Amino acid sequence: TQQPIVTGTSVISMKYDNGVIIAADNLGSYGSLLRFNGVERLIPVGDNTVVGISGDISDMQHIERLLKDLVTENAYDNPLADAEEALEPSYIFEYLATVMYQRRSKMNPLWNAIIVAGVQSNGDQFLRYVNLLGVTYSSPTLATGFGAHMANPLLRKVVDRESDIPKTTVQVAEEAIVNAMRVLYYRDARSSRNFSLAIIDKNTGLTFKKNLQVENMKWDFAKDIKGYGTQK
Amino acid sequence: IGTGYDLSNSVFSPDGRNFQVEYAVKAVENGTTSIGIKCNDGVVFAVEKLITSKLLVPQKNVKIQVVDRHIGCVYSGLIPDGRHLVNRGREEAASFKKLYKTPIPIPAFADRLGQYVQAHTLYNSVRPFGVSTIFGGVDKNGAHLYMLEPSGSYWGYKGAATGKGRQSAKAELEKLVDHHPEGLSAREAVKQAAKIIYLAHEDNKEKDFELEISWCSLSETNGLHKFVKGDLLQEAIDFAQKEIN
């Protein structure tokens, strides 16, 4: 029975009208020590999905290899596979849902919180959760780990329910994920300034933006705090 | 030849041959022409896929199959036996990928295939394989092309042939070396691959064939394997039609 040794914390995601955003800090925290820098959570799979993986970096690597063999699996025995039996986010999710459970049943849990975000080739927004209790649910907005408690309410203003999707656009959604990051940077210890942010659209395709920096920086209110409660 | 020694792929004749192993090459002859062309920056695979009647769905039947994504295989001989070997090739690649975190080198790939075929000429309750596999690709060691015989035997080749049209094929292949000591760069080798299958077909001038060309090219696919499809293929068809007449 594995325990987390090194862990990623927080992937945030949301739905918008023509596709989805998935984003996460880049960090492999070895507990209290911020051990590893430049660790990349977001792995493109096929070209219409990004799967983000938080939790044990040790389990992550293993999941990365399984994901790469799923792409390779689709090529094998197919005359083509870029629109014939092209790899959808949903197929990937189902392949993962089964293995996390199977492993849970053998009592060696893949210790992860996973969000699969993508778009289908049917025009359908896909965004769904799986984790190491093998629990699954579909929801319009998702977040894992610390970020569930913290950042997910904030996105829930932007989209509460599934009839405010057509009234939210790509510039606005992008804006909301970055303000969500700012907040994870401030108020979470295993969150770095470094972050990656991927936009999968069914029209624009994959945009993977790497090494963005938190901005809109508030620290200039800090000189007016003097003492702990009573101190002149 | 004589009586005995035939029946089981483990019995030797006096001559130092084993008739069953010999019988396995004979079986590939009846199969449909395959060629490989090695190049300084690619490999080209071409195959003659016979169409029995005009009922067949065109471009929807292949003997070219992929291993990992950088290795081409194409077989001649018995079709389903050939599938089995390629299945196993995927298994070989996949296992290497897990351990070492990298795509198979071509000499690594040749070794493990060559053993699997050899095992199935080693026992009494097994059967000898009935397929040849011209195969290869491009890797971190450059381009390589191999041709695997039904015995469990292989060697490297600059240009390789097996199947019904293999005498027309080897003859041309040799010609290719004399005219081109530089061995032909990958683009012109597509068009050229076409002309060899068109020639090989003057011993297969019975029924129609479908020309399928694939490649794996360092310069022009980025070391990955992909089929040649669309207008590239057409150009290769038109050149071959011209120069045969």
Swiss-Prot record, chain A:
Keyword Cytoplasm among UniProt keywords: yes
Instruction: Return the PROSITE patterns for the record.
Output: PROTEASOME_BETA_1, PROTEASOME_BETA_2
Per UniProt, subcellular location reads as: Cytoplasm; Nucleus
| Broad class of where this protein is predominantly found | cytoplasm
Q: Which Gene3D superfamilies match?
A: Glutamine Phosphoribosylpyrophosphate, subunit 1, domain 1 (3.60.20.10)
Do the record's keywords include Transferase?
Answer: no
Q: Which UniProt keywords apply?
A: Cytoplasm, Nucleus, Proteasome
Q: Which domain of life is it from?
A: Eukaryota
Q: Name one Pfam family in it.
A: Proteasome
**SUPFAM superfamilies for the chain:** N-terminal nucleophile aminohydrolases (Ntn hydrolases) (SSF56235)
Instruction: Fill in the misc note.
Output: Present with 16900 molecules/cell in log phase SD medium.
Recorded hits in PANTHER family, A to Z, give: METALLOPROTEASE TLDD, PROTEASOME SUBUNIT BETA
Q: Which family does it belong to?
A: Belongs to the peptidase T1B family.
What's this chain's function?
Non-catalytic component of the proteasome which degrades poly-ubiquitinated proteins in the cytoplasm and in the nucleus. It is essential for the regulated turnover of proteins and for the removal of misfolded proteins. The proteasome is a multicatalytic proteinase complex that is characterized by its ability to cleave peptides with Arg, Phe, Tyr, Leu, and Glu adjacent to the leaving group at neutral or slightly basic pH. It has an ATP-dependent proteolytic activity. PRE3 and PRE4 are necessary for the peptidyl-glutamyl-peptide-hydrolyzing activity.
User: What is its quaternary makeup?
Assistant: The 26S proteasome consists of a 20S proteasome core and two 19S regulatory subunits. The 20S proteasome core is composed of 28 subunits that are arranged in four stacked rings, resulting in a barrel-shaped structure. The two end rings are each formed by seven alpha subunits, and the two central rings are each formed by seven beta subunits. The catalytic chamber with the active sites is on the inside of the barrel. Interacts with CIC1.
* Record-given protein name: Proteasome subunit beta type-7
Biological source species: Saccharomyces cerevisiae (strain ATCC 204508 / S288c)
From Swiss-Prot, chain B:
One Pfam family of this chain: Proteasome_A_N
Q: Which InterPro entries does the annotation name?
A: Ntn_hydrolases_N, Proteasome_alpha, Proteasome_alpha-type, Proteasome_asu_N, Proteasome_sua/b
- Any one GO MF annotation of this record: mRNA binding
Xref: SUPFAM superfamilies:
N-terminal nucleophile aminohydrolases (Ntn hydrolases)
> Cellular component per GO?
nucleus; proteasome complex; proteasome core complex, alpha-subunit complex; proteasome storage granule
Q: What keywords does the record list, in alphabetical order?
A: Acetylation, Cytoplasm, Nucleus, Proteasome
**Main location per UniProt?**
cytoplasm
- Posttranslational modification: The alpha and beta forms are probably products of the same gene with different post-translational modifications.
Q: Where is the signal peptide?
A: none
Return the Gene3D superfamilies for the record. Answer: Glutamine Phosphoribosylpyrophosphate, subunit 1, domain 1
Where is the protein found, in the record's own terms? Answer: Cytoplasm; Nucleus
What family, per the record? Belongs to the peptidase T1A family.
Q: What does the record note on quaternary structure?
A: The 26S proteasome consists of a 20S proteasome core and two 19S regulatory subunits. The 20S proteasome core is composed of 28 subunits that are arranged in four stacked rings, resulting in a barrel-shaped structure. The two end rings are each formed by seven alpha subunits, and the two central rings are each formed by seven beta subunits. The catalytic chamber with the active sites is on the inside of the barrel.
Protein name, as recorded: Probable proteasome subunit alpha type-7
Organism encoding this protein? Saccharomyces cerevisiae (strain ATCC 204508 / S288c) (Baker's yeast)
Q: Which gene encodes it?
A: PRE10
